[PDB]
Amino acid sequence: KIKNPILTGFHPDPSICRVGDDYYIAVSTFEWFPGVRIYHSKDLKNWRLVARPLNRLSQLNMIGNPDSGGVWAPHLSYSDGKFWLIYTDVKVVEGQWKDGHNYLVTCDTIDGAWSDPIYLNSSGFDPSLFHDEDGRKYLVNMYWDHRVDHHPFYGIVLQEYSVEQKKLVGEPKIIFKGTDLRITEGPHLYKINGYYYLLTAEGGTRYNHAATIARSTSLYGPYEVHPDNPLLTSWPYPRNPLQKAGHASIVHTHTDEWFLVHLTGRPLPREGQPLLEHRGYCPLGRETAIQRLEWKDGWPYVVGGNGPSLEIDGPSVEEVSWEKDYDEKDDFDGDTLNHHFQTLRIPLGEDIATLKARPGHLRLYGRESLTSRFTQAFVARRWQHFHFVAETKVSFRPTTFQQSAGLVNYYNTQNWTTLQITWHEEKGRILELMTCDHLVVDQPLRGREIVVPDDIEYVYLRVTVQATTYKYSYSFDGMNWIDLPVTFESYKLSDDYIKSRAAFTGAFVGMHCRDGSGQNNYADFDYFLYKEL
């Protein structure tokens, strides 16, 4: 029935929420705006994107945020007639500190206008809101220890949240220190039988990742750990196509069944490589998967052992699937950008991105370079398959080398590749390739750039991705295409390749326009095509 991953491409930290017979999963979005994606399902198999809650500067202001800062793991719940969304804005992501703030927003409906944030605390990321049976509310999060002689993951902190006073009350207490896997994060609380069950993520979000579960009769512990912990992990299964299994959340369905959603990374093919030396590269980032849970002696168990199954049995409900929510060829005739498109850190107003200036075209007025954490005229969508084609049609007339416009394959500000139109003193308006690898830039078509003829209005730009490798191509007419003689490697756009280890997103493909002279020069994009192959 259900084949994993259920949300493919960049969809980390799944937070599942049941309301009656409707099912919702919220995922993390990091530096990508608007914040948080929420998907809806009736059967836990078929998923549609239904909300992007954090879309006002008042809720989320990420200008200047570092790569893989911003919205880390979110928590979605439903109680007292409304949804509650907890999120972080992480400002520091390297060194001894992880400075970040936790906020609560609510909405009567999933896709409404969510409230302005209530500040909660800053003591660590992965905040989660528990609604106890007695009506009381409790916030759990990881607690950050910056000290040099210490492991940073101090455990799980708990504090009561007062709905009336709109603040945390009483005194924060550590309720769980973790197991020897450490890196204890992603806390979630569940009241089942006579017990409070505390789910955590452990071992870090790379190949040692795990989901850990413990139980207590007291909300404050001590929590005893699952006798066969971890509840879930891919670490001891190096051949499993689903790696990095952890950061899970539990759903008890209306049909009295139990399921476990979690993130996973799918490494590129590694034939002829040592199995254990380096466990792979994941250009699709961390995706969402689902597993079935069964119960023994007051403990939940992943059906099929503690490793993640590629295929599972769905809940005992009717199949409810959804119509495709985007066009393979987006011709930009709508009065809104398709919701699969995102921008970096900030919303782009009509002065930067516009569908209005020229009907049938997305106009991007050139801003800063692809290395800027501030203002980029860049509109992009996730890689969601290993094998796909992406294509755009653009008219652009740069008057200086400081201006560019192109198709970008992009991981972060220091890691990206592009086929772009720019200007050259001798050759005039040209086509070139440009790559950025850990801030180091190369121009591989150096001295051999494609001259664009004065009479060509639209340049056609394409990328064809084939698992491990990809190639750029172009056309001046839309029918006859020419390969550019450079083979690119998809592993360079993966979490695992990034040397900072603050690498929590995934590859995007999109349309960019830069104007470094500040003359407000723009490019018109007639369509954007994304098609799985």
Enumerate residues 298-357 that contact a copy of itself by CB under 8 A: none
Task: Name which position in 371, 464, 468, 475 contacts a copy of itself (CB under 8 A).
Answer: 371
Give the phi and the psi of residue 454 in degrees, each rounded to 5. -50, -30
Residue 360: CB minimum distance to Ca ion, A: 3
Q: Rule CB under 8 A: is residue 120 a binding residue for a copy of itself?
A: yes
Convert residues 332-351 into a mask of x (bound to Ca ion by CB under 5 A) and - (unbound): x-------------------
Q: Rule CB under 5 A: is residue 524 a binding residue for Ca ion?
A: no
Residue 397: CB minimum distance to Ca ion, A: 18
DSSP 216-237: ESSTT-PPEE-TT--SEESTT-
Q: Per the structure block, which two tokens stand in for 237?
A: 């299964």
Give buried/exposed letters for 391-407 (b at 16+ CB in 10 A, else e): bbbbbbbbeeebbbbbb
Exactly one of 185, 202, 432, 524 is catalytic; name it: 185
Please give the C-alpha separations between residue 157 and each of 130, 178, 329, in angstroms, as whole numbers: 13, 11, 48
Helices (H), 103-146: none
Quote the CA–CA distance of 342 and 511 in Å, as a whole number: 11
Give the phi and the psi of residue 376 in degrees, each rounded to 5. -115, 130
Provide the 10 A C-beta neighbour count for residue 305: 12
Residue 528: CB minimum distance to Ca ion, A: 9
Find out whether 125 and 68 touch, Cβ atoms under 8 Å: no
Quote the CA–CA distance of 238 and 240 in Å, as a whole number: 6
13 a catalytic residue: yes
Task: Name which position in 39, 84, 235, 386 contacts a copy of itself (CB under 8 A).
Answer: 235
Residue 481: CB minimum distance to Ca ion, A: 19
Q: Rule CB under 8 A: is residue 479 a binding residue for a copy of itself?
A: no
Provide the 10 A C-beta neighbour count for residue 316: 11
How many amino acids of this chain bind Ca ion (CB under 5 A)? Answer: 5
Q: Please identify, using beta-carbon distances, which residue of 14 and 127 lies nearer to a copy of itself.
A: 127
How many amino acids of this chain bind a copy of itself (CB under 8 A)? Answer: 63
Stretch that binds a copy of itself, among 128-136, 243-251, 272-280, 334-342 (CB under 8 A): 272-280
Q: Rule CB under 8 A: is residue 276 a binding residue for a copy of itself?
A: yes
Please give the C-alpha separations between residue 344 and each of 61, 371, 379, in angstroms, as whole numbers: 11, 11, 8
Find out whether 424 and 401 touch, Cβ atoms under 8 Å: yes
Residue 332 binds which entry of Ca ion, a copy of itself, none, CB below 5-8 Å type-dependent: Ca ion
**Tokens 């603040």 identify what position?**
167
Which distant-in-sequence residues (6+ apart) come within 8 Å of 479 by Cβ? none
Residue 102 binds which entry of a copy of itself, Ca ion, none, CB below 5-8 Å type-dependent: a copy of itself
Enumerate residues 360-379 that contact Ca ion by CB under 5 A: 360
Q: Rule CB under 8 A: is residue 368 a binding residue for a copy of itself?
A: yes
Read off the amino acid at residue 160.
E
Residue 329: CB minimum distance to Ca ion, A: 9
Provide the 10 A C-beta neighbour count for residue 50: 18
Residues tagged active-site: 13, 185
Q: Which chain residues interact with a copy of itself by CB under 8 A?
A: 63-65, 91-92, 94-97, 99, 101-102, 119-123, 144-149, 151, 172, 180-183, 203-204, 208, 235-236, 239, 272-277, 368-369, 371-375, 401-402, 414, 436, 439, 441-443, 446-447, 515-519
Footprint of Ca ion (CB under 5 A):
331-332, 360, 526-527
